[PDB]
């Protein structure tokens, strides 16, 4: 049998040399062009174990996106380990592009094509691909954005559901669009709109899947974050190069027994952020002028469950470790050495 192995994965993308957007610039130097001749080969009669929670592809992508951000988005001031650095901090164009990860000679990427594959254990429908599908490296908390949807139904995955310390990665099968805007002409005030009925329907369907996992007799409750850094208490993300912190209380206050068409989340653009790359803080310059707007597909969520009786399970928005973001897309893949 061919064994899981760590190698030097390379990235591929449709990045353009003439596009000054920062993912494009990074990918122009770090990546090759998207595979012009993709080849997926079914491995007949092969069953292969996967383990999405221990997949070095995740660690490799993490280091790459750290490098992309570190090269691309310079803070004016950065504080790590009590030491301060200051530097030029130009505003940039920022819009993620899909990045593919590819295995070099001597290695193969295995892909699990089992429907509603839970991320660990045996996969009976395995293929090889030269590269992964194109993954937008979106850095965010609570909601996973612009990702890949589940094919037939919502799927929830955890390294260990019974362990309340483990994050639950939800994969939706229907996107919910969320539109976030800092209006043209308080420069730090912004907001996000999404359909109320769609979001409620989504929570209802996740709750059903949580009940499947935890017990039919359970009552499912969503509550907001219990607290911590604002990055994880809010739905935080980068739009147009600005750091948005959106109050998600309305998204995560729900019970089974029940006006307005749209949910409006209040957001703030922040200059001082806790870094995701490494432990420390960074200060960026004030927001650019003009309309700053992003329209995103919510395609997943990161949740935690309160530990323990008595018949009720409470789920709150989580995230923070961006590895779970990468994992939400890389869960069907592993790298093996051809031997």
């Amino acid at each position: 049998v061919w064994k899981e192995a760590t190698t030097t994965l390379f990235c591929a993308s449709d990045a353009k040399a003439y596009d000054t957007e920062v993912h494009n610039v990074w990918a122009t130097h770090a990546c090759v062009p998207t595979d012009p001749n993709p080849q997926e080969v079914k491995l007949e009669n092969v069953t292969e174990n996967f383990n999405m929670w221990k997949n070095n592809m995740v660690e490799q992508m993490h280091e790459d996106i750290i490098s992309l951000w570190d090269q691309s988005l310079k803070p004016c001031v950065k504080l790590t380990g009590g030491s301060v650095i200051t530097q030029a901090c130009p505003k940039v164009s920022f819009e993620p592009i899909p990045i593919h990860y590819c295995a070099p000679a001597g290695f193969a990427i295995l892909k699990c094509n089992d429907k509603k594959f839970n991320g660990t254990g045996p996969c009976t429908n395995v293929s090889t691909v030269q590269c992964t599908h194109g993954i937008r490296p979106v850095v965010s908390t609570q909601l996973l954005l612009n990702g890949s949807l589940a094919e037939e139904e919502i799927v929830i995955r955890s390294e260990n559901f019974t362990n309340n310390a483990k994050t639950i990665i939800v994969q939706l099968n229907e996107s919910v669009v969320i539109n976030c805007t800092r209006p043209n002409n308080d420069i730090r005030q912004a907001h996000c709109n999404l359909s109320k009925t769609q979001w409620e329907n989504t929570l209802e369907q996740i709750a059903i899947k949580l009940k499947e996992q935890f017990g039919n007799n359970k009552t499912i409750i969503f509550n907001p974050s219990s607290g911590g850094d604002p990055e994880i208490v809010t739905h935080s993300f980068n739009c147009g190069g600005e750091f948005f912190y959106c109050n998600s209380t309305q998204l995560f206050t729900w019970n089974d027994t029940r006006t307005g068409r749209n949910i409006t989340l209040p957001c703030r653009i922040k200059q001082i952020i806790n870094m995701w790359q490494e432990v420390g803080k960074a200060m960026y310059a004030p927001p650019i002028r003009g309309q700053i707007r992003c329209s995103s597909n919510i395609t997943g969520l990161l949740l935690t469950r309160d530990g323990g009786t008595n018949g009720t399970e409470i789920f709150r928005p989580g995230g923070g470790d961006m590895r779970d973001n990468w994992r939400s897309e890389l869960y069907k893949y592993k790298v093996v050495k051809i031997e």
Binding site: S226, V279, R323
Partner: peptide, 27 residues
């Protein structure tokens, strides 16, 4: 993550602190 300061701040909130990557999460 600064786990101690995280535990420090969350304790003040009457909760435990734990890292969520490089961020502090209260439990």
């Amino acid at each position: 993550x600064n786990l101690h300061f995280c535990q420090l701040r969350c304790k003040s909130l009457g909760l435990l602190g734990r890292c969520a990557x490089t961020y502090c999460a209260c439990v």
